[PDB]
Design a binder for this molecule. Structure first.
Ligand SMILES: O=C(Nc1ccc2c(c1)CNC2)c1ccc2ncsc2c1
Lengths: 156, 39
């Protein structure tokens, strides 16, 4: 249906009322979100139907209508902006300097902001407005807070 | 059945609310895409 580029909310009517399950990005005819948001289920845009094209449970990413289009990356130095789209609340750019997730496979970026689980899929942006990853998959620290990694896919 | 709704444009905005710390954490990612704090 509406295939305009931009940030979108993922909603379900399966429970009581309309519950937001996550967020996503429409870019170049492809909808990009986190796998745990949809679990590979077909989405709907008005009368239209989005079907999954690519998906990986370890990367925690899933694209709809085509291959992954987001290829920009964090430079390790610059402050980023999380375009947070919270449940029931208006979209909001939150500037922050990311941290590092040290893994056996290599270092990853990490945004430490306190938002509901339904904010999962919100794009992390650079000073150019490009999407350098998605918010929604990380860890729980000593304070009960969440620290999400900057999850980017692979453009072929 | 899940559905999508437009929430806005993807743009970088100047003079935005600047908040949050930058922590360095030792983590592990499993086959299920779940992260874990390793020490
Ligand atoms: O539970 C969350 N995320 C998640 C769930 C299930 C799976 C994965 C990630 C990875 N594959 C299985 C979560 C919790 C709190 C929160 N606060 C802001 S975003 C955010 C996400």
């Amino acid at each position: 249906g509406e295939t305009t580029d931009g940030v979108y909310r993922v909603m379900t009517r399966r429970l009581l009322g309309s519950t937001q399950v996550g967020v996503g990005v429409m870019q170049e005819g492809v909808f990009h979100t986190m796998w745990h948001v949809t679990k590979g289920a077909a989405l709907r845009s008005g009368e239209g139907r989005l079907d999954p094209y690519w998906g990986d449970v370890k990367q925690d990413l899933v694209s709809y209508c085509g291959p992954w289009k987001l290829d920009a990356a964090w430079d390790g130095l610059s402050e980023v902006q999380l375009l947070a789209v919270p449940p029931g609340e208006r979209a909001k750019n939150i500037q922050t300097l990311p941290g590092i997730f040290k893994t056996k496979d290599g270092d990853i970026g990490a945004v430490a902001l306190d938002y509901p689980a339904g904010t999962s899929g919100s794009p992390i942006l650079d000073k150019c407005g490009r999407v350098i990853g998605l918010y929604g998959n990380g860890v729980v620290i000593k304070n009960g807070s969440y620290v999400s990694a900057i999850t980017q896919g692979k453009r072929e | 059945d899940m559905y999508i709704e437009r929430a806005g444009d993807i743009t970088w905005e100047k003079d935005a609310e600047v908040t949050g710390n930058s922590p360095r954490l030792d983590v592990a990612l499993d086959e299920s895409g779940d992260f874990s704090l390793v020490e």
